[PDB]
RNA sequence: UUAAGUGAAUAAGGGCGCACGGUGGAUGCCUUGGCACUAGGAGCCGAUGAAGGACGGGACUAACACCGAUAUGCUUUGGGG
RNA sequence: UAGUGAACCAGUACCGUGAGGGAAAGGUGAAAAGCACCCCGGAAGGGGAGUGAAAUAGAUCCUGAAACCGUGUGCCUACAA
RNA sequence: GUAUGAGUAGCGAAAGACAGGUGAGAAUCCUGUCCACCGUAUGACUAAGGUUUCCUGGGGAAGGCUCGUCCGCCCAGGGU
């Protein structure tokens, strides 16, 4: 483990960061938050490969309810609720890949706090 | 026929001690090492002395010298400017003053 | 509690032999030779492993 | 409760002008301040 | 070659001298204001509204001075150019 | 730091409800001729070029001592109370 | 006027995260989304009291216990 904040705030932080990268695939944050994001997200994409109701009814907890991500319309407005993107897009990409779905880079410290910073992608 | 242009900065809102830490890391070194060293330190006195070195190189270009590729930092000073003075209300009625300091910084760029 | 006497000019300095700033390892670019930190993304280039990352 | 709780009445019906033109002591007060040359004679 | 013996120099930093800067305004010099007096004037002002003040007046008005709804001024008599 | 408290917009700023208590603050050059123009920098600040006899007289502006903070170097110091 | 202690004590009770902006520059400014706290009150109206802080457009030398493109701060114009 890594203690970062109080007890029941780490649950809220790691829910709220890791519903980004489901949306953006880039996050510019610090070291330790990124390493906990490693662990949780690569636990979450493994549920993206089953497709069961247990895949829904366990991933529904650790992802925000909802959050819009709308890039498609022909004569419609279709709305991915950022859990549906696990089970329609992010799942069947890495179906032949085993573990190791993330990359972590080392850029710079921050201007006012000297906190060294980190990019996260997938591939 | 002179080498060794100069450039100063006057009454800059930092300490006189903390600015002497960066200037530990610049004496005797070439200009190519110096700007690279100054890019990768997270201090207030990092981003100040860069402007001094760039202005000194610009003096050496547009006034006297040539040979940017053979310039050496030879002298470096940190001096004490005038000190601002304020007060803080400390508990049980009384007060205690606060010094707020500034510094004068000069850097000399010779050729060889 | 309370300091007994003024410390002189000698013990001002003989403390401060461990108050140094230093810089740890710096390396050339893959593609430009400019000095950049090891294991770090190139800020002036964007390259890493000779590959541009900071782009779209 | 600390002290100096202001009112617009009481600081002119104690320390005003008309209650220093009421006795032979308010007149001492005003003529003692005028020999100091002070602008604000009374509140 | 072995053995026994002698053994300098280098400074993370520091002390002393010299040289060069910065902060701070002592001292040197100067008057625009004082202090103590001298000779002479003068030694009261007010219900015809006093002393002291408030508010206002300029092309531009924050303040000082000057002035008063005739408001940065009016009339007359001498000086002046 | 003298001389009125006050040479300077001082019985002011400030402190106390009130009667009251009461500071620090002068000096560029002979004349503003107070740095057009170029360069670094967001600016401040600086470097040239100019004015000036002199800018280490550039608006904190005559002279610029001491504590105090720095830079370079001739000599010495890591078995010493 | 300047040290000493000393770059030590402290920064005055509380949950934030990411994306995109303007910008010389961003943990601190603007916008968006989710999360979180009080709710006989951290919500609405008024009496004292304060005396232009209210509004609009600019600015960043000092104040703001950090930064600050921001402000009850400064400039200029207006409102009862
Ligand atoms: Zn590179």
From TrEMBL, chain A:
PANTHER family reported for this sequence: LARGE RIBOSOMAL SUBUNIT PROTEIN BL17M, RIBOSOMAL PROTEIN L17
Binding-site residues for Mg(2+), renumbered to this chain: 20, 66
Highest taxon of source: Bacteria
Gene3D superfamilies: Ribosomal protein L17
InterPro entries xref list: Ribosomal_bL17, Ribosomal_bL17_CS, Ribosomal_bL17_sf
Any GO molecular function: structural constituent of ribosome
Description of how the protein assembles with itself and partners: Part of the 50S ribosomal subunit. Contacts protein L32.
Family: Belongs to the bacterial ribosomal protein bL17 family.
GO annotations of cellular component type: cytosolic large ribosomal subunit
A Pfam family per the record: Ribosomal_L17
Annotated protein name in UniProt: Large ribosomal subunit protein bL17
Any GO BP: translation
Species: Enterococcus faecalis
Keywords: Metal-binding, Ribonucleoprotein, Ribosomal protein
From TrEMBL, chain B:
Function text: This protein binds specifically to 23S rRNA; its binding is stimulated by other ribosomal proteins, e.g. L4, L17, and L20. It is important during the early stages of 50S assembly. It makes multiple contacts with different domains of the 23S rRNA in the assembled 50S subunit and ribosome. The globular domain of the protein is located near the polypeptide exit tunnel on the outside of the subunit, while an extended beta-hairpin is found that lines the wall of the exit tunnel in the center of the 70S ribosome.
Summary of subunit composition and partner proteins: Part of the 50S ribosomal subunit.
Family: Belongs to the universal ribosomal protein uL22 family.
Keyword S-adenosyl-L-methionine: no
PANTHER family: CHLOROPLAST 50S RIBOSOMAL PROTEIN L22-RELATED (PTHR13501), LARGE RIBOSOMAL SUBUNIT PROTEIN UL22M (PTHR13501:SF8)
Keywords: Ribonucleoprotein, Ribosomal protein, RNA-binding, rRNA-binding
Organism, as annotated: Enterococcus faecalis
Xref: InterPro entries: Ribosomal_uL22, Ribosomal_uL22_bac/chlpt-type, Ribosomal_uL22_bac/org-type, Ribosomal_uL22_CS, Ribosomal_uL22_sf
Gene Ontology annotations for the cellular component aspect, listed alphabetically: cytosolic large ribosomal subunit
Gene: rplV
Name used for this protein in its record: Large ribosomal subunit protein uL22
GO process annotations (BP): translation
One example GO MF annotation: rRNA binding
A Pfam short name: Ribosomal_L22
Highest taxon above the source species: Bacteria
Automatic annotation (TrEMBL), chain C:
Top-level taxonomic group: Bacteria
Keyword Zinc: yes
Organism ancestry: Bacteria, Bacillati, Bacillota, Bacilli, Lactobacillales
Protein's recorded name: Large ribosomal subunit protein bL32
GO CC annotations on file: large ribosomal subunit
Native source species: Enterococcus faecalis (Streptococcus faecalis)
Keyword Acetylation: no
Family, similarity comment: Belongs to the bacterial ribosomal protein bL32 family.
One of the record's GO molecular function terms: structural constituent of ribosome
Keywords, comma-separated and alphabetical: Metal-binding, Ribonucleoprotein, Ribosomal protein, Zinc
Binding-site residues, Zn(2+) 2: 29, 36, 45
InterPro entries: Ribosomal_bL32, Ribosomal_bL32_bact, Ribosomal_zn-bd
UniProtKB/TrEMBL annotation, chain D:
Name this polypeptide is given: Large ribosomal subunit protein bL34
Region (Disordered): 1-43
Keywords for this protein: Ribonucleoprotein, Ribosomal protein
Entry keyword rRNA-binding: no
One GO term (biological process): translation
One Pfam family here: Ribosomal_L34
Protein family (similarity comment): Belongs to the bacterial ribosomal protein bL34 family.
